[PDB]
mmCIF file of C-alpha atoms in Angstrom:
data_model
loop_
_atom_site.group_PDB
_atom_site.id
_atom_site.type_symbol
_atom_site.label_atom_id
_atom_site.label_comp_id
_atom_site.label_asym_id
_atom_site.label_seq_id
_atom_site.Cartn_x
_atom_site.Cartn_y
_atom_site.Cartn_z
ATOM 1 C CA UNK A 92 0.000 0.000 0.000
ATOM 2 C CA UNK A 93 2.893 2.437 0.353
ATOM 3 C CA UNK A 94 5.256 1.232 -3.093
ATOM 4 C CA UNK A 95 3.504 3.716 -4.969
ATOM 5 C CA UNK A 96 3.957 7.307 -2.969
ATOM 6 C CA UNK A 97 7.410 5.572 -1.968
ATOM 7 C CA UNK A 98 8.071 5.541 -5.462
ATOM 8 C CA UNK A 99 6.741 8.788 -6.259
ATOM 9 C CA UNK A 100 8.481 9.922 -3.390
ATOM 10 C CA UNK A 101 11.858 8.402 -4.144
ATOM 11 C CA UNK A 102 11.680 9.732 -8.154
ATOM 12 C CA UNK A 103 11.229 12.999 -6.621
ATOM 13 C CA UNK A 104 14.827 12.670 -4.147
ATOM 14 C CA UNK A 105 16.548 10.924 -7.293
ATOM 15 C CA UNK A 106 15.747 13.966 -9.756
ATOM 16 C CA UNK A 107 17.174 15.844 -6.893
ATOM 17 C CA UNK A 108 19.835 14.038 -6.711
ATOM 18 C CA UNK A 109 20.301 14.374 -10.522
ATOM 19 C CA UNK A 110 20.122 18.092 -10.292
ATOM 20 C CA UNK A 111 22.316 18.192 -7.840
ATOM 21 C CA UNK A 112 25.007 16.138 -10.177
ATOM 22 C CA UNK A 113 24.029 18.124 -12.857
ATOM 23 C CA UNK A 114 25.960 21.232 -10.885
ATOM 24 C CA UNK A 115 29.285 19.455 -9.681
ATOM 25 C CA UNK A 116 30.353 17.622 -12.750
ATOM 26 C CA UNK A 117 28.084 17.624 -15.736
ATOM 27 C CA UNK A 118 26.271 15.863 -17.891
ATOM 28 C CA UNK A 119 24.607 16.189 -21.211
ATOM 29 C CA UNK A 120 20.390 16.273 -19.115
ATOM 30 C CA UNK A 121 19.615 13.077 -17.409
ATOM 31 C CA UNK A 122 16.636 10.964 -16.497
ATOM 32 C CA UNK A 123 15.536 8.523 -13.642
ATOM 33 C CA UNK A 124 13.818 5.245 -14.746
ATOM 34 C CA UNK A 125 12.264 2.275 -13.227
ATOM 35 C CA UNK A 126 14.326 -0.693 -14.599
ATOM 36 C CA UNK A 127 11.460 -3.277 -15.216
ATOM 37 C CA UNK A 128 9.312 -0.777 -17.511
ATOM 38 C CA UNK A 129 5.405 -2.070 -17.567
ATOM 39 C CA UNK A 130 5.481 -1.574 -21.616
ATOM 40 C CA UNK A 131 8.216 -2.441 -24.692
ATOM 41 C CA UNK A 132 10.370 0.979 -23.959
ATOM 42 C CA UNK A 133 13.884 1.814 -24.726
ATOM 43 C CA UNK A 134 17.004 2.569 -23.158
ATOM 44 C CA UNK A 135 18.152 6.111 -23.192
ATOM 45 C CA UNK A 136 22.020 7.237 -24.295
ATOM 46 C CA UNK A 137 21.734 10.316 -21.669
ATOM 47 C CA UNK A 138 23.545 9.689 -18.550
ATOM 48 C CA UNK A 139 20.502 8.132 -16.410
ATOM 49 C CA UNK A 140 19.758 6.479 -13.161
ATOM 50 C CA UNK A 141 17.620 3.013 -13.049
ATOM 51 C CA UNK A 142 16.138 1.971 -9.718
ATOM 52 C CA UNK A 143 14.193 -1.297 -9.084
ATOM 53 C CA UNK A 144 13.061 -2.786 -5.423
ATOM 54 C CA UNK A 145 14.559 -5.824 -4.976
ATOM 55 C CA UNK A 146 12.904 -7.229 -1.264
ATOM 56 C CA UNK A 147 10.918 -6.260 1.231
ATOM 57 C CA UNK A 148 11.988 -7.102 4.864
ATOM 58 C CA UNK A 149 9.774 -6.604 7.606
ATOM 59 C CA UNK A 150 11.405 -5.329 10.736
ATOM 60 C CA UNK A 151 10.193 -6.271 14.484
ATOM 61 C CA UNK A 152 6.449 -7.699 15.211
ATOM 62 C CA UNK A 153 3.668 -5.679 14.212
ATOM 63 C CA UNK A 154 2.517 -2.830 16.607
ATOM 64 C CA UNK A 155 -1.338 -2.844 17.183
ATOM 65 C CA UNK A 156 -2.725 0.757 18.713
ATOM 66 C CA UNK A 157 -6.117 0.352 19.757
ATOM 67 C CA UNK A 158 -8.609 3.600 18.137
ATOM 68 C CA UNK A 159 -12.151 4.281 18.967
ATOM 69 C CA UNK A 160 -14.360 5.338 16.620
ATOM 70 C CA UNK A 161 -16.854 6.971 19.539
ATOM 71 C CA UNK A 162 -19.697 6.587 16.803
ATOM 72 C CA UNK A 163 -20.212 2.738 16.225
ATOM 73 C CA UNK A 164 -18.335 1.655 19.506
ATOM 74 C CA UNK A 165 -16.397 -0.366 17.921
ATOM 75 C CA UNK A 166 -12.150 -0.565 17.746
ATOM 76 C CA UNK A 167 -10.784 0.140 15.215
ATOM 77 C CA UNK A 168 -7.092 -1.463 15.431
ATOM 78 C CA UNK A 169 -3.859 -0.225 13.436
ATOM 79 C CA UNK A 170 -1.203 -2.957 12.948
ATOM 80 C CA UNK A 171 1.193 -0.860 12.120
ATOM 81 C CA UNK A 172 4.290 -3.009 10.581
ATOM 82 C CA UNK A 173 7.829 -1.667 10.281
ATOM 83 C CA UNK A 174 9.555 -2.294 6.708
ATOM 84 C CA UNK A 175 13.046 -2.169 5.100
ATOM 85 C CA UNK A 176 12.397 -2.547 1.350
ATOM 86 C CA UNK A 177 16.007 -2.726 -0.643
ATOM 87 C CA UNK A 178 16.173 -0.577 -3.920
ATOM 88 C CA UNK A 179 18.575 -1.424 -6.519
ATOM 89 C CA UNK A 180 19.499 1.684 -8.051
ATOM 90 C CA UNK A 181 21.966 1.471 -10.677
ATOM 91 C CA UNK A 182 23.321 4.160 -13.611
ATOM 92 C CA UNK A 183 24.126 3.745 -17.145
ATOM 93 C CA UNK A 184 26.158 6.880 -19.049
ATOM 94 C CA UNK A 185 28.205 5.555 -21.819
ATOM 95 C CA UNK A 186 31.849 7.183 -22.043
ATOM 96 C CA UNK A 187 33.313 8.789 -25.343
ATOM 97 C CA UNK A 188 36.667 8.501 -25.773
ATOM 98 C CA UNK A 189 37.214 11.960 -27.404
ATOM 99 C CA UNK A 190 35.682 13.575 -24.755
ATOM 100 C CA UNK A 191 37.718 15.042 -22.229
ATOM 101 C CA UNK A 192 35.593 15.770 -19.078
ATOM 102 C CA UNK A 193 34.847 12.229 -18.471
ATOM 103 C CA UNK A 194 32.431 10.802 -15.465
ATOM 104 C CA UNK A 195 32.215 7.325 -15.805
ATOM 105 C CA UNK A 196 28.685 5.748 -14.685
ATOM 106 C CA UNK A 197 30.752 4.247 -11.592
ATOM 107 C CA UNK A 198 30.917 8.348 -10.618
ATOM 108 C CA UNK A 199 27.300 8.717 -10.991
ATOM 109 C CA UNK A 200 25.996 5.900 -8.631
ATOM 110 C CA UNK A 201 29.180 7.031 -6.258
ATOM 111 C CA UNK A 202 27.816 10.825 -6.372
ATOM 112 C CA UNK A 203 23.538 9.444 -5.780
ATOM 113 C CA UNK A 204 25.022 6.912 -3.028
ATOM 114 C CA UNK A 205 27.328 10.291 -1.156
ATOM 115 C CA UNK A 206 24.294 12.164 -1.830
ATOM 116 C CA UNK A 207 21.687 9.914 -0.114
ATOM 117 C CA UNK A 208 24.149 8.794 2.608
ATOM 118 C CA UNK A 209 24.450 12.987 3.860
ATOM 119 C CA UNK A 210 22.794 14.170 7.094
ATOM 120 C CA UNK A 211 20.845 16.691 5.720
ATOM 121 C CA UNK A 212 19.539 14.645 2.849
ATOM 122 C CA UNK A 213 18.737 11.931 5.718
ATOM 123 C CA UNK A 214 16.556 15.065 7.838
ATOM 124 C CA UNK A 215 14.525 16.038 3.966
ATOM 125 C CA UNK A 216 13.762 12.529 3.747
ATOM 126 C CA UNK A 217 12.877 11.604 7.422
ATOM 127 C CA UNK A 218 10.158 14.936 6.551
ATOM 128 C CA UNK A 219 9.499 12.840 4.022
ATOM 129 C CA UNK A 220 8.221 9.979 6.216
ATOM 130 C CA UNK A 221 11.115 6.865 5.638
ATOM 131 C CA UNK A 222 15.070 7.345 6.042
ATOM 132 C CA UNK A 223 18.095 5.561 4.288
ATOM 133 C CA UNK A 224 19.969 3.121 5.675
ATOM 134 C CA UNK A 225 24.115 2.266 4.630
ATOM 135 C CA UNK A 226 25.440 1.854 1.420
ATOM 136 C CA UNK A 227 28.232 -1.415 1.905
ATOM 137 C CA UNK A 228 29.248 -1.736 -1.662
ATOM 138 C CA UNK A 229 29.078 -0.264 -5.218
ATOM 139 C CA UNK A 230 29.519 -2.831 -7.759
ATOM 140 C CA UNK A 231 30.689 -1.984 -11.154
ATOM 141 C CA UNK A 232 30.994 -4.235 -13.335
ATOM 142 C CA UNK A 233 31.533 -4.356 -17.500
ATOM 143 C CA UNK A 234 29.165 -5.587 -20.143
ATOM 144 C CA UNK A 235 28.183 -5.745 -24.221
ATOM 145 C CA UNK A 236 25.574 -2.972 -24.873
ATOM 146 C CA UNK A 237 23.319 -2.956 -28.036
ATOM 147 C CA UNK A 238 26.348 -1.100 -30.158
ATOM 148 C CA UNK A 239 28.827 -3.997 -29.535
ATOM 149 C CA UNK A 240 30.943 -1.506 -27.475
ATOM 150 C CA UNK A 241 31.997 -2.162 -23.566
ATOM 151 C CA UNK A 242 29.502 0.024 -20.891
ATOM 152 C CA UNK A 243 29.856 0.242 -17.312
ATOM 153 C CA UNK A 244 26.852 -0.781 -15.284
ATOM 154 C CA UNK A 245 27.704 0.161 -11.484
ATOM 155 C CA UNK A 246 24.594 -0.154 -9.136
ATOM 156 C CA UNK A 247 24.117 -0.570 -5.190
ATOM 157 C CA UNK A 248 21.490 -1.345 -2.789
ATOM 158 C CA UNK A 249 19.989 0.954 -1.018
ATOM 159 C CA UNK A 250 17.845 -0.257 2.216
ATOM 160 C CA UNK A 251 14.687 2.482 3.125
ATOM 161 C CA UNK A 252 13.137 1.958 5.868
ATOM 162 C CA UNK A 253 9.116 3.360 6.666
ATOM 163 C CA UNK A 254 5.911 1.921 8.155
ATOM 164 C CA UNK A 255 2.661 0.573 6.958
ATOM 165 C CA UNK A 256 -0.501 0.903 9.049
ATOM 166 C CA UNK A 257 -3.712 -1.435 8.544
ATOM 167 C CA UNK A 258 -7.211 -0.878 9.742
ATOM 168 C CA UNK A 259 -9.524 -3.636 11.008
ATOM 169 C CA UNK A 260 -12.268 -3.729 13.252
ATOM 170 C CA UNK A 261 -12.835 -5.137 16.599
ATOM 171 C CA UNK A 262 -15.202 -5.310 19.922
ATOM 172 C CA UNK A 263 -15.325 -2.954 22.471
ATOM 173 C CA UNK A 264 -16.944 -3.491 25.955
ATOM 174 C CA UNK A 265 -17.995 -1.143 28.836
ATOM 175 C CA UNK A 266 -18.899 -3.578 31.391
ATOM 176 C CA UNK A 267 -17.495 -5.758 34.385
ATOM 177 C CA UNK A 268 -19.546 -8.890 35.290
ATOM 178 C CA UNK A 269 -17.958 -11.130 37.337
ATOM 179 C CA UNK A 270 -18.519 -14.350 39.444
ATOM 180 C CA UNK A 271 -17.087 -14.314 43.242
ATOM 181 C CA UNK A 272 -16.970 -18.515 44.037
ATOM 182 C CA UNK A 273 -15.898 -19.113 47.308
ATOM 183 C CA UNK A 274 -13.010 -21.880 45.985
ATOM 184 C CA UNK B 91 17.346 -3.603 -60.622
ATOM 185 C CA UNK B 92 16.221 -6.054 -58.838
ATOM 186 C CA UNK B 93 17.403 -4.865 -55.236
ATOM 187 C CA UNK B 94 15.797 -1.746 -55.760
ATOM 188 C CA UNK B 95 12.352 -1.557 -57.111
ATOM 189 C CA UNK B 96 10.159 -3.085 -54.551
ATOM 190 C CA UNK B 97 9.692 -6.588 -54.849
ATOM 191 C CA UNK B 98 6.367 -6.735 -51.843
ATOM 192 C CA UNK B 99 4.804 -4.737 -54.077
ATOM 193 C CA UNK B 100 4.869 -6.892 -57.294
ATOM 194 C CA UNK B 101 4.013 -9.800 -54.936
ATOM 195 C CA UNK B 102 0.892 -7.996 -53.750
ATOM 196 C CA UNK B 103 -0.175 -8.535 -57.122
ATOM 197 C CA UNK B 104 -0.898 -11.802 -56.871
ATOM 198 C CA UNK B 105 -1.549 -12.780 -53.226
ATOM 199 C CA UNK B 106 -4.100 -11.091 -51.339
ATOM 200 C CA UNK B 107 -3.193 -8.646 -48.835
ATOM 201 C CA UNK B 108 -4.753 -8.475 -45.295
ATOM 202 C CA UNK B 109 -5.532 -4.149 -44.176
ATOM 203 C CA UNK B 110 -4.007 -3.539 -40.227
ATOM 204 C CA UNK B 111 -4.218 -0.449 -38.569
ATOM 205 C CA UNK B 112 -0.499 0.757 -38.050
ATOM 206 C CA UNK B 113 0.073 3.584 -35.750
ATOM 207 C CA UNK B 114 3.829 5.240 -35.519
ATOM 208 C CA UNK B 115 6.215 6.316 -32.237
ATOM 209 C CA UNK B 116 5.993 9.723 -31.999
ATOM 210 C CA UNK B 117 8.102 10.617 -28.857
ATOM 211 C CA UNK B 118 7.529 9.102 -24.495
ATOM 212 C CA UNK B 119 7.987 10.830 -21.772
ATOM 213 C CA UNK B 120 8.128 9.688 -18.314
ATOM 214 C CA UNK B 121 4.546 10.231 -15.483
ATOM 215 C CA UNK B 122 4.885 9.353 -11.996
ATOM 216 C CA UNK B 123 6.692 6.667 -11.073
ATOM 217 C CA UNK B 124 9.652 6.823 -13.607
ATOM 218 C CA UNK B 125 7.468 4.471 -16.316
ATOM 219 C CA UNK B 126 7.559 5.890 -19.310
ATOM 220 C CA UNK B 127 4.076 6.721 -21.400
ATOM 221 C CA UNK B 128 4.405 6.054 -24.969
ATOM 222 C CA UNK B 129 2.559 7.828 -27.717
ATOM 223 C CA UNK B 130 1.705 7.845 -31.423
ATOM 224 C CA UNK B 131 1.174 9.591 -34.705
ATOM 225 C CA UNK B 132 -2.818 8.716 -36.076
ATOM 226 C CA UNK B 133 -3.221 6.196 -37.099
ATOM 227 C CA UNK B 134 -3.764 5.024 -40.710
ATOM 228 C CA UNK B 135 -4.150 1.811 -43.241
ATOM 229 C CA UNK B 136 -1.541 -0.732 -43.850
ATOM 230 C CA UNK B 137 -1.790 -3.183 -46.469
ATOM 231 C CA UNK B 138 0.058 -6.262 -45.521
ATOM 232 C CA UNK B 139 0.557 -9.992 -45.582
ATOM 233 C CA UNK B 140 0.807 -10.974 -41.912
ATOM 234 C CA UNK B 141 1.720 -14.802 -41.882
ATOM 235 C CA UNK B 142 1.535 -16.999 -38.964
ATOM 236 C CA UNK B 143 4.047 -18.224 -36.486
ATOM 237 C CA UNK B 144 4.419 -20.971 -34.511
ATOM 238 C CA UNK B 145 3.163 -20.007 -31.106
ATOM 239 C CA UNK B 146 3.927 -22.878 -28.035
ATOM 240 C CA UNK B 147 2.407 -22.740 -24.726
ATOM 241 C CA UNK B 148 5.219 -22.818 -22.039
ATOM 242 C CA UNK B 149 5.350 -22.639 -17.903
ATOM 243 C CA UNK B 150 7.088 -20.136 -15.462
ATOM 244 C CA UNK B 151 6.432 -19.964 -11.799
ATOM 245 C CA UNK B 152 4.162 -23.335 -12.063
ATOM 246 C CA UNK B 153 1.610 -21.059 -14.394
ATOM 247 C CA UNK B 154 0.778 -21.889 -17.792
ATOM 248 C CA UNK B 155 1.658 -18.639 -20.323
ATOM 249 C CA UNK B 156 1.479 -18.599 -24.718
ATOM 250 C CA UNK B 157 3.218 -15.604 -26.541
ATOM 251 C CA UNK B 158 0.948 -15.273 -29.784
ATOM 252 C CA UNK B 159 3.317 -13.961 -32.691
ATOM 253 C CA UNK B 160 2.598 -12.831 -36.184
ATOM 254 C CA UNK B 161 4.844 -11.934 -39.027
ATOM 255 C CA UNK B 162 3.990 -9.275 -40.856
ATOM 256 C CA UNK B 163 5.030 -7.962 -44.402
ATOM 257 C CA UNK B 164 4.698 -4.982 -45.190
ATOM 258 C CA UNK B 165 5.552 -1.950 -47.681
ATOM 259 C CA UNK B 166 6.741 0.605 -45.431
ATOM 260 C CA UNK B 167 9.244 1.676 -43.102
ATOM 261 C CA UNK B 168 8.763 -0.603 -39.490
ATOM 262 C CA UNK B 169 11.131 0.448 -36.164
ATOM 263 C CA UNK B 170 10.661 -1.731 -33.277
ATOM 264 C CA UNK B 171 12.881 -0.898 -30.059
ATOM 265 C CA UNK B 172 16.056 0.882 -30.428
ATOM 266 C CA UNK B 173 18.031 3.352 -28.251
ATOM 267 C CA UNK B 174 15.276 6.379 -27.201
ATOM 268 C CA UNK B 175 13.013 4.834 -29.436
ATOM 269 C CA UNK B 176 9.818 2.723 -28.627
ATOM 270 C CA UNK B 177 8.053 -0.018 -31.136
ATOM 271 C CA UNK B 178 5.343 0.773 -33.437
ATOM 272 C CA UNK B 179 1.886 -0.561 -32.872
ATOM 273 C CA UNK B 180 -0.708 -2.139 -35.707
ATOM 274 C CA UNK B 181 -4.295 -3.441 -34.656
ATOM 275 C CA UNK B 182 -5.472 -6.802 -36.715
ATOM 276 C CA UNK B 183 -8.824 -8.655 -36.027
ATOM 277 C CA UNK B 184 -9.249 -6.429 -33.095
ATOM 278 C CA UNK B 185 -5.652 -7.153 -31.405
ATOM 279 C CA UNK B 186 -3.162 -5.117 -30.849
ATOM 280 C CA UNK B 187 0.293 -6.461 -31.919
ATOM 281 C CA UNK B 188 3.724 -4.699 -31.486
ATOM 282 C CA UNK B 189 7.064 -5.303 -33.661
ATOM 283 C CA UNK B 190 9.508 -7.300 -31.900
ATOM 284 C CA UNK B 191 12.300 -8.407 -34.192
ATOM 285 C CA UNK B 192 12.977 -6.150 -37.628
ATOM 286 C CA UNK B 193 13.722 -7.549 -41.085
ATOM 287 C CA UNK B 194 14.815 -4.035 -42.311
ATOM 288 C CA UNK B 195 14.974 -4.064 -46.590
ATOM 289 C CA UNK B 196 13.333 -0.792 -46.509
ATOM 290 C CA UNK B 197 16.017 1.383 -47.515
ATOM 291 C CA UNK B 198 17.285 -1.003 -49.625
ATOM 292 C CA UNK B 199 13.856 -2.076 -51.289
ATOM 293 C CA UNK B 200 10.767 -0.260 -49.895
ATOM 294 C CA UNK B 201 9.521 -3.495 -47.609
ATOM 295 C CA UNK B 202 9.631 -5.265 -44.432
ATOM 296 C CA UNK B 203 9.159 -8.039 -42.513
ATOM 297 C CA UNK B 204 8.581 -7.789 -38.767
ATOM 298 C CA UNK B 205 7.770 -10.400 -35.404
ATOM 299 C CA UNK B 206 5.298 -9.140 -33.585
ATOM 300 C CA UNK B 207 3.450 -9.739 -30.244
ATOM 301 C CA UNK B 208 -0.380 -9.734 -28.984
ATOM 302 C CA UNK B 209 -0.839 -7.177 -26.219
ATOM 303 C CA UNK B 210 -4.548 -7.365 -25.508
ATOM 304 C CA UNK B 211 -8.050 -7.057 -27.085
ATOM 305 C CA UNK B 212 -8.618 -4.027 -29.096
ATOM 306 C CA UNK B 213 -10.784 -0.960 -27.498
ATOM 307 C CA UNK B 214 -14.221 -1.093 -29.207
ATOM 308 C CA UNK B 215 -15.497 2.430 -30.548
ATOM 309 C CA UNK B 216 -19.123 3.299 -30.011
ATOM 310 C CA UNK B 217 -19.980 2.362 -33.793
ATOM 311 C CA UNK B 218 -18.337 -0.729 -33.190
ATOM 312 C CA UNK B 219 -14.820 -0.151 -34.788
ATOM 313 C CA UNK B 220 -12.352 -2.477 -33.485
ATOM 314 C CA UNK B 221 -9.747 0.788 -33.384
ATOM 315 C CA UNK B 222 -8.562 2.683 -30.632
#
């Protein structure tokens, strides 16, 4: 139930991010994609950044508040359940050997991870509702793309963590009836 | 000469020729949620020979899935994915097929031949057109 505005919500930091990259170093414009694109859609030669969620690891039991409604007497209980969902974000910028001012894709993710990873990013996005756990690793690793030249894919995982709140119904009671046996 | 000319278009001659709705890439942008949106020039009348191909069912994940393909020939220019570029989309019998392999010749010969995939059933108009 959250994946969507955590989406929307992470597009929106990324583009920041990519804003951001656009003024220390540059780049000929940029995008953010999801990786696994719903519909036949190609990939773009601008400099871009791909994310993707990978798991979803729930953290601790679920809490359950208890919340009167006052109208129908009845409960209404939130299980509220802590999550860590895992984001592979990854980059893709091809690199011209004529060009001079060179940023390898490796640079990009590096720059997005640095980014994500300051304080003051961590404050905008705990306003935001979730925070950012550490980055361990940035893998970058070599492959064919479509022009049968060699392209740098780097990418890293990147672990948010938020809650989720459900709303059932229950009971209530307003009475105390009990039975005194003498054992 | 022979490699020029256009060679589907003598064959048309003779074998009949089925009419698909093609509809060109025009540009895609990205809405909410970093998928991109594609759209497309009108539409307008193809005339074409789309043959059949040999479509088996297979399993992933213990379900049961088929991917229905047609091969289509046809006298004009045909782009499936490339680099900042989505696939075209044609409409036959009320399905929606996109290219998914290309056979090119155009610039060498006017013609092409193209693999494409069912999507879905067609939207039906409010006259009953089997068009978008």
């Amino acid at each position: 139930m959250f994946d969507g505005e955590l989406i929307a919500k992470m597009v929106v930091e990324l583009n920041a991010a990519m804003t951001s990259a656009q003024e220390a170093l540059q780049f000929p414009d940029f995008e953010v994609v999801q990786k696994a694109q719903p519909t036949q859609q190609g990939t773009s030669t601008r400099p871009t950044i791909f994310f993707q969620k990978l798991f979803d690891i729930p953290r601790g039991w679920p809490a359950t508040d208890w919340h009167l409604d006052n109208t129908t007497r009845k409960y209404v209980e939130i299980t509220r359940q802590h999550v860590e969902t895992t984001f592979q974000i990854s980059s893709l910028h091809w690199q011209n050997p004529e060009i001079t001012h060179v940023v390898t894709a490796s640079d990009i993710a590096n720059y997005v991870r640095a980014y994500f990873q300051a304080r003051s990013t961590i404050e905008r996005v705990k306003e935001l509702d979730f925070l950012i756990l550490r980055v361990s690793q940035i893998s970058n690793e070599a492959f064919e793309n479509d022009n049968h030249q060699f392209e740098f894919h780097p990418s890293f995982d990147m672990v948010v963590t938020y809650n989720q709140y459900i709303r059932l119904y229950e009971n209530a009671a307003y009475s105390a009836d009990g039975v005194l046996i003498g054992v | 000469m022979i490699p020029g000319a256009n060679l589907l278009r003598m064959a048309f001659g003779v074998i009949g020729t089925q009419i698909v709705k093609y509809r060109k890439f025009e540009q895609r942008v990205k809405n909410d949620q970093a998928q991109y949106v594609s759209m497309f020039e009108e539409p307008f009348d193809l005339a074409a020979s789309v043959q059949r191909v040999r479509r088996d069912q297979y399993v992933q994940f213990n379900l049961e899935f088929q991917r229905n393909y047609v091969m289509i020939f046809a006298n004009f220019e045909m782009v499936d994915l490339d680099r900042d570029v989505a696939g075209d989309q044609f409409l036959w019998t009320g399905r929606v097929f996109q290219l998914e392999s290309q056979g090119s010749w155009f610039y060498q010969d006017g013609w092409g031949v193209c693999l494409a995939v069912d999507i879905g059933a067609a939207k039906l108009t409010d006259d009953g057109k089997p068009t978008f």
